[PDB]
Design a protein around this ligand. Structure first.
Ligand SMILES: *[C@@H]1O[C@H](CO)[C@@H](O[C@@H]2O[C@H](CO)[C@@H](O[C@@H]3O[C@H](CO)[C@@H](O)[C@H](O)[C@H]3NC(C)=O)[C@H](O)[C@H]2NC(C)=O)[C@H](O)[C@H]1NC(C)=O
Ligand code: J94
Ligand code: J94
Ligand code: J94
Ligand code: J94
Ligand code: J94
Ligand code: NAG
Ligand code: NAG
Ligand code: CL
Ligand code: CL
Ligand code: CL
Ligand code: CL
Ligand code: CL
Lengths: 205, 207, 203, 206, 204
């Protein structure tokens, strides 16, 4: 307890909070999606509701420490309010994202941060053809709302969405789910991760 | 990092926040709408739901700096809570506006601020005739709720609503969408009031 | 900007906030309703939903200033959190009121305050007969939740509800709409403004 | 204004807030319900929605003053955040209580506090038989969530729910409505107020 | 009153708040569920709604005191905001949990804390077969979202969910309800959950 309180005091009370990236000090944020359930489909509004968690990883020099100066603490947990977090936004949401997990992040001695918010998201998707073998494909882009590619670069470690927590008795079967980095233009480049999900009705009973 | 922290400290910790415009120091706010989806229509209540983002631009002397004194930083991002933002309100909404984007703004060295809130809005609209070739026209005015034309002037850079992010598989097809400044008066008052009239003509998507 | 920051600093940072009226220093609050839409009717629950704004006016000595000492500023806008506001409540609501406008008020050099919250309100109303020529009448009382008539007096400037922003393609046509002060008893007297609205389905 | 600001300063800024009752300094909290409407019934989930206000009364030495030292002020209004309030909870709610009134209380010179929150409550109730002459009976217990009978003694002044603000054109007619203290044992006593409401669908002719 | 104000001042104003457990100072949190109602079932979305309260118990050295130094006060009540609370999360919820009780905890002189939040939870559950004698079984795991088994250990005092406040006129009858500690791994570090398993049917 004593060493951790010291470590947190040294990192957070002394310095101001990290103000975010700039053109000369850009930040790479790595995203991975863990899809849990397609909960609902609305064919009259073309809205589909997903439950997932979203692993976010980035690294800052100002959060580094030597474990030896702090009782060999290699990492700790702290409220996401205590640190800067990236402003990752679904571009085609139709309702505010509903938060399903505590807003708490893991900080490691090398300055790495891991934050895994669980979310329910309504987004624009035409479900026509969902009761077929071919199913239906829908997509939603995740991006920083305010930072260009020169400030925040997004990437994934893998192109495959993790389906290992996908609810086995969901009304919808996942045929494929990918997560792919894209470069958009508008004067200046912006980056997104395109979440593409192909699915169909699983018929039961 | 070091230079940006200094710049933010110099602008925000020293001064109080901008208290808003007055009759002798008015503010011009420029609006542009980027329509993403007509999500639903309710013909039993005459409510229609829009998803859009709304680019807002204004300029303040107290947010100016010289890039040379701060490592050639020309702009930065910061929480909208750190600065004054205009109170732009839909005049004929039927539900509170739902916020769909982070409350973060871009501040430029000349004192310009750009803030682009994404929103879902329910507003008053009779959709009768939406299932026809002519479609239906609906309108909603955006205005400062509390400031007259002598304190906040609203304008647009273009009369055409940007449809470039409009959802291609929406249930509703956009036939036209305009955004037009209007000057209103009222018989007793000694002041004009300004709005931006968003006018959208649309129909159910055909086969 | 500089003068306004000074004025706000002088009024708000120096003094504590106005603590509200007392028996020896009562406050008159003037109310006026501007009805925009009857949005829906629920005949299975006897709830009706109204969209309106509500102009509220009162006056306090502690908010006065001389324009000459502050660059001829005659009035300003500020967050409703920065000042005392009256706690005007619908007596027969069935859901929390939904706020449709920024919580910002206008303060004038004489100490006058004007606050105009736009609201969506669900309230108790039997709509039976709404599909007829005579239509249906419903009423809702607005009152301070906590202050008696000896602390807050409510009144209206006019008996007639302003219908000038009423939505022309509403499903419901307004036949009449009045706003009238009432005195209630239970020992101490309490004041309300009774909003009475007669309406029908548009023909 | 000047005297009231002084009085509030003397009561709130000097002392810490009242930390709540203990076994050696118990508090009596009196409840009364004022039922306004049974708004809806859901026979597929056995949930019923009530609108009411709930008058809460208690008394604290630390909120006493002499009116003569403060311009003959006998009472004032203040935000419920400025004072301790009891944690009275419906035991069988199915949704968070929806607040319909400002969170403001009335404090009197003798240290009495009156707080009257208006609420919409969804609670567990089987409405089967509501469309009959006998109607249906449903009940919900109100209790302090954390305090025993040795810390908060909870009571009513009357066993009859006040129906004087009940909406005359409600879909549901109130046949009876009571509010009755129940004192339980298990060594320490635990208290609730049982709100029991018998009602039926309003009859045109029957 | 005077002694309690002193005690709270000494515990909360002097020290910083407990920062949470670490690998070298782990915390055991004991959970018990008190099921009140299965309120609804949605067979078109496979969501089921439960109302329950959840007794949570843990112990911290920094919240200890000697009753003799504080007028023989053995325990007190305080806002949950005044102390650290564990971030116990339903792993398969579909909506934010709705809070049905005041956020207030009981702290005892030995440093024990008891916190009993009442909740309405929507979670993933296929109700197909609920209208039968056998009924249907559904499960939801409760876990710390952020702490491994080396920081937070979860357990139960009993394997049986308390049904003593279960609503007698619910649309759904409880056939069985268990609460069981589980140890999970992934392809390195172990994480702990309490599996709430409920078998139920439509009331006949
Ligand atoms: C708010 O309104 C006030 C009147 O409506 C303005 O007051 C005026 O300010 C002027 C500028 O300082 C004064 O001018 C001066 O006049 C006197 C003789 O009256 C001369 O001796 C001075 O030389 C002359 N100024 C100069 C620079 O030579 C006016 O006298 C004065 N009028 C009044 C009080 O009635 C305020 O300036 C105005 N505030 C603003 C615009 O911020
Ligand atoms: C479309 N988005 C992702 C959000 C809204 C928006 C609205 C805009 C804009 C860019 C953007 C972008 C996004 O937001 C930015 O502020 C931004 C964006 C992308 C790339 C950028 C940006 O600033 C410099 O380079 O330029 C003028 O109006
Ligand atoms: C609807 N708004 C934008 C706000 C509230 C309001 C309240 C009113 C009114 C018009 C308005 C308008 C608008 O906003 C004003 O603040 C305002 C408005 C119009 C005309 C005015 C105003 O103040 C003095 O004369 O007429 C009488 O009471
Ligand atoms: C009905 N209202 C408006 C709200 C709730 C309420 C509940 C009550 C009561 C008065 C009131 C009034 C209103 O609220 C007050 O607190 C109050 C009210 C009116 C007059 C008063 C009051 O306190 C002293 O004099 O007396 C007993 O139970
Ligand atoms: C339902 N209430 C009133 C509140 C919460 C609660 C939570 C519980 C419990 C009983 C209760 C009761 C009430 O609150 C208590 O703390 C309590 C209660 C009743 C009986 C008790 C208690 O502690 C020892 O014996 O048993 C296990 O977890
Ligand atoms: C699935 N959860 C509950 C949340 C997200 C997550 C994301 C992960 C992970 C584990 C977890 C777990 C849980 O959250 C943690 O932070 C965590 C978790 C389990 C085990 C752990 C953990 O940190 C060290 O050992 O390992 C790599 O990326
Ligand atoms: C921390 O690591 C060192 C290096 O091996 C180890 O010997 C020591 O036991 C650890 N810390 C403390 C406080 O003993
Ligand atoms: C506290 O405990 C002691 C030990 O029995 C007792 O004799 C004493 O009277 C108590 N004092 C107070 C202030 O409660
Ligand atoms: Cl940081
Ligand atoms: Cl500003
Ligand atoms: Cl004030
Ligand atoms: Cl108190
Ligand atoms: Cl703690």
């Amino acid at each position: 307890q004593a060493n951790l309180m010291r470590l947190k005091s040294d990192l957070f009370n002394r310095s101001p909070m990290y103000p975010g990236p700039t053109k000369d000090d850009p930040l790479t944020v790595t995203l991975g999606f863990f899809l849990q359930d397609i909960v609902k489909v609305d064919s009259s509004t073309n809205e589909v509701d997903l439950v997932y968690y979203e692993r976010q990883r980035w690294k800052l020099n100002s959060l580094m420490w030597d474990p030896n100066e702090y009782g060999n603490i290699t990492d700790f947990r702290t409220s996401a309010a205590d640190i800067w977090t990236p402003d990752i936004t679904a571009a085609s949401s139709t309702r505010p994202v509903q938060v399903l997990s505590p807003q708490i992040a893991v900080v490691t001695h090398d300055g790495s941060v891991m934050f895994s918010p669980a979310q329910r998201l309504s987004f624009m998707c035409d479900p026509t053809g969902v009761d077929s073998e071919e199913g239906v494909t829908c997509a939603v882009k995740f991006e920083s709302w305010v930072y260009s590619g020169f400030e925040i670069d997004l990437k994934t470690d893998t192109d495959q969405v993790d389906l290992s927590s996908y609810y086995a008795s969901s009304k919808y079967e996942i045929l494929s789910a990918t997560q792919t980095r894209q470069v958009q233009h508008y004067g200046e480049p912006y980056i997104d991760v395109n979440l593409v999900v192909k699915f169909r009705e699983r018929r039961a009973g």
